[PDB]
Amino acid sequence: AVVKDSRPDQIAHDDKTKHLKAAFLRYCRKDILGAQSMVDSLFSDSDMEPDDELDLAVNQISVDLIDDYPASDPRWAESVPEEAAGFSNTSLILLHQLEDKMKAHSFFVDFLHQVGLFSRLSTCQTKGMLVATRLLLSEHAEKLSAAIVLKNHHAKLPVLVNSAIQLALDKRMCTVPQNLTAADVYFREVSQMEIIFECLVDKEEADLESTSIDSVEWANIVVNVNTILKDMLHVACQYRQSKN
């Protein structure tokens, strides 16, 4: 019997990293037997002892997981960010995958906070600065919550947020043709929230400089943008206060 996960069959290293983050997601969701079976079927050993190397490895795995999407059957594998075989902005399977990733991250955080043993873990590096693995997981979960509330805003009103993300990508030089969506491109490159913030700032600056602040439509547009940012900050602060 061969126990493994479904992959869209891409690069070898990409598939290996995808299997690794899928095993990590299973370990988070407490599918210990399935994760061990898939590890013994693919590699040999993955989970080690808490140390700086393990923290860096789990940080890279979480980055790959928030950049991609887990799978198990072709139904879940069709949502992996491909090129011409899936990932076309859907508020159903993508939402379920995102909520499953969030549940796994929350369960892992709750377990590692309730075990009451943090002296065994170290502090990994992030952008040249030393941060804790708990803070890194909290930041990843905050990014996931921002993505899911952006998906909710898309399901509510898709045109405004879609045009905003498209303008941001066009300003940051990320041309998207008629095969993919700017929202899906942002979900794939979610690791650039600081760049997306500057893109929105530049978009608002262009909107204010191309007008004459004397109408109502521009005020409504800037109010909607401020409300989107308000929802982002609100869900971030809510998750942080819940994890505090």
Partner: protein, 81 residues
């Protein structure tokens, strides 16, 4: 024939893969079947068969249509089973 008679595969040409599929005939037929109680996986072809069929390559315009149809079919089968 239900896919061919849809109001999105050849009538509308927007870029929103949300309401464009809901404003068709396939979603309405699936909702009627779900409300009636007929199984969508045994009394209807599967998503794999619908994807492997050659009618998609001749009736499609962008990948958004195919992805949204596949996701809706999978969600309906999951909520019916």
């Amino acid at each position: 024939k239900a896919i061919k008679r849809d109001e999105w595969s050849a009538t509308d040409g927007k870029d929103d893969p949300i309401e464009a599929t809901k404003d068709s005939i396939f979603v309405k037929v699936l909702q009627n079947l779900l409300n009636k109680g007929i199984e969508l996986k045994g009394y209807l072809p599967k998503a794999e068969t619908l994807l492997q069929s050659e009618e998609l390559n001749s009736l499609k315009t962008n990948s958004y249509f195919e992805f949204s149809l596949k996701a809706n079919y999978e969600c309906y089968m999951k909520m019916q089973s």
